[PDB]
């Protein structure tokens, strides 16, 4: 008979358990006897305190490195303001150690965790190369709760030794199962923000990860976009509880919060994950949380049935993260077949924007090809344009089966004149999809400015298998 | 950039 765990502060982990529904389905997990054993997690941040009473019984020095100073020693940089407590706080929430009569307990707190250091400093693209390849036969899972600001007029993703870096981690990683990399999906949402305009989250190769308040809410920091996949839960309003977790100066806290904290709960049930399956796939991973996130009581206006019957939101992905059907489904999890890509270019000639444009294009999907795609993973629309007010713009793109992906919502205060240069626009939301027929493309000036410009370049480019398919739900 |  499975105890749960005696941390003081377990009680207030509203999120991991309770009678009442509203959680992420944790100890039905540790019920079957996952809690992280053998998983290596490590935070991407501002370092990690090591010896924490709540993480140092966990830590892994091989899951870990200072880039900043270029050390192996993640400790965190202590300051007046404490600023540099925040990788420790998402730590704590993977793999804080249970039972042992200090603060909570970490998501899968018995795997191994470790911190690299590299936000403490300038962090250049070689800095975020160096954290994203760290040990990769070592580290099974990577934690990102950061990325470009969030002021609601950048674009910005990973530069080429960082892409380098996710495409050598999903390829040669953990065996040459991949990498996991997991991403906070933003905090702009007072700014109107698009986590499409974020390279790290609009990347195939992360799991970018929105939040719900404890009363099923988008918060208030929440960015709406089609390339987030899922959600855990964070804080909300005054009224609703917050995160618990290890605090910097060997403290606990019980308000962590925002975009941050979303991304280590889903690294931990990742973790739990890969103990019911060691074998799985990055791409395999991505499947089990589309089959088994829950919508229920999410509350959003944009909740749509896609081609397969899976409901799917902007402001959520698929839905929490459910930590109990995620493991029961990993352990029979048969591989994926090797990814497929077909590359459409879907233009003959640049088409002017003016107040609408719609593009429609029936495609194939490379038929006849080994690359032949029938069940659709991600799907991108990389776009060239240029358009004299970037944030005027809306941009949509519908699927054969009828699903209509937000690639970009207004952003009021992106003045940019300097358009999309082959911006890959990632979906999540036509997953397991025959991708064959006919494609739409709208872009619209959202404002009553005469507003100018031209598309000069429309890839659409699928990913997918050809093979595996569920009865859709 | 990057920012938590
Ligand atoms: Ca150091
Ligand atoms: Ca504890
Ligand atoms: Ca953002
Ligand atoms: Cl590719
Ligand atoms: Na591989
Ligand atoms: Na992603
Ligand atoms: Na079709």
Same mark, same amino acid.
């Given at each position: 008979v499975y105890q749960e765990p005696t941390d003081?502060?377990?009680?207030?982990?509203?999120?991991?358990?309770?009678?009442?529904?509203?959680?992420?389905?944790?100890?039905?997990?540790?019920?079957?006897?996952?809690?992280?054993?053998?998983?290596?997690?490590?935070?991407?941040?501002?370092?990690?305190?090591?010896?924490?009473? /709540?993480?140092?019984?966990?830590?892994?020095?091989?899951?870990?490195?200072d880039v900043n100073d270029q050390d192996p020693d993640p400790q965190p940089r202590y300051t007046q303001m404490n600023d540099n407590r925040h990788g420790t706080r998402c730590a704590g929430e993977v793999a804080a150690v249970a039972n042992n009569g200090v603060?909570?307990?970490?998501?899968?707190?018995?795997?191994?965790?470790?911190?690299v250091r590299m936000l403490d400093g300038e962090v250049?693209?070689?800095?975020?190369?160096?954290?994203?390849?760290?040990?990769?036969?070592?580290?099974?899972?990577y934690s990102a709760s950061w990325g470009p600001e969030d002021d609601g007029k950048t674009v910005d993703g990973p530069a080429r030794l960082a892409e380098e870096a996710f495409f050598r981690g999903v390829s040669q990683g953990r065996g040459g199962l991949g990498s996991i990399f997991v991403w906070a999906s933003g905090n702009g949402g007072r700014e109107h923000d698009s986590c499409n305009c974020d390279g790290y989250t609009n990347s195939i190769y992360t799991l970018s990860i929105s939040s719900?308040?404890?009363?099923?809410?988008?918060?208030?920091?929440?960015?709406?976009?089609?390339?987030?996949?899922?959600?855990?839960?964070?804080?909300?309003?005054?009224?609703?509880?917050?995160?618990?977790?290890?605090?910097?100066?060997?403290?606990?806290?019980?308000?962590?919060?925002?975009?941050?904290?979303?991304?280590?709960?889903?690294?931990?049930?990742?973790?739990?994950?890969?103990?019911?399956?060691?074998?799985?796939?990055?791409?395999?991973?991505?499947?089990?949380?589309?089959?088994?996130?829950?919508?229920?009581?999410?509350?959003?206006?944009?909740?749509?049935?896609?081609?397969?019957?899976?409901?799917?939101?902007?402001?959520?992905?698929?839905?929490l993260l459910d930590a109990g059907a995620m493991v029961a489904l990993a352990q029979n999890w048969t591989t994926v077949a090797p990814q497929r890509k077909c590359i459409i270019d879907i233009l003959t000639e640049p088409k002017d924007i003016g107040k609408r444009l719609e593009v429609r294009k029936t495609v194939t999907a490379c038929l006849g090809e080994p690359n032949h795609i029938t069940r659709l993973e991600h799907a991108q629309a990389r776009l060239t344009l240029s358009?004299?007010?970037?944030?005027?713009?809306?941009?949509?793109?519908?699927?054969?089966?009828?699903?209509?992906?937000?690639?970009?919502?207004?952003?009021?205060?992106?003045?940019?004149? /300097?358009?999309?240069?082959?911006?890959?626009?990632?979906?999540?939301?036509?997953?397991?999809?025959?991708?064959?027929?006919?494609?739409?493309?709208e872009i619209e000036?959202?404002?009553?400015?005469?507003?100018?410009?031209?598309?000069?370049?429309?890839?659409?480019?699928?990913?997918?298998?050809?093979?595996?398919?569920?009865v859709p739900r | 950039x990057x920012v938590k």
């Open positions: 003081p502060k377990f009680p207030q982990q509203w999120y991991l358990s309770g009678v009442t529904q509203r959680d992420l389905n944790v100890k039905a997990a540790w019920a079957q006897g996952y809690t992280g054993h053998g998983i290596v997690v490590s935070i991407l941040d501002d370092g990690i305190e090591k010896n924490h009473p /709540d993480l140092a019984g966990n830590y892994d020095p091989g899951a870990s490195f603060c909570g307990v970490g998501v899968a707190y018995n795997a191994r965790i470790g911190g250049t693209d070689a800095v975020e190369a160096r954290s994203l390849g760290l040990n990769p036969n070592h580290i099974h899972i719900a308040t404890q009363f099923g809410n988008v918060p208030w920091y929440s960015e709406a976009c089609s390339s987030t996949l899922a959600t855990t839960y964070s804080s909300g309003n005054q009224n609703e509880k917050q995160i618990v977790t290890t605090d910097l100066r060997q403290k606990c806290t019980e308000s962590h919060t925002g975009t941050s904290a979303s991304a280590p709960l889903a690294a931990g049930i990742i973790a739990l994950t890969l103990e019911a399956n060691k074998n799985l796939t990055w791409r395999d991973m991505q499947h089990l949380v589309v089959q088994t996130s829950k919508p229920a009581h999410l509350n959003a206006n944009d909740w749509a049935t896609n081609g397969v019957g899976r409901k799917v939101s902007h402001s959520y992905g698929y839905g358009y004299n007010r970037r944030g005027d713009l809306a941009i949509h793109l519908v699927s054969p089966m009828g699903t209509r992906s937000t690639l970009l919502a207004a952003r009021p205060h992106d003045y940019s004149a /300097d358009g999309f240069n082959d911006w890959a626009f990632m979906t999540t939301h036509s997953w397991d999809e025959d991708p064959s027929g006919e494609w739409v493309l000036n959202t404002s009553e400015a005469n507003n100018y410009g031209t598309l000069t370049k429309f890839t659409l480019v699928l990913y997918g298998t050809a093979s595996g398919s569920l | -």
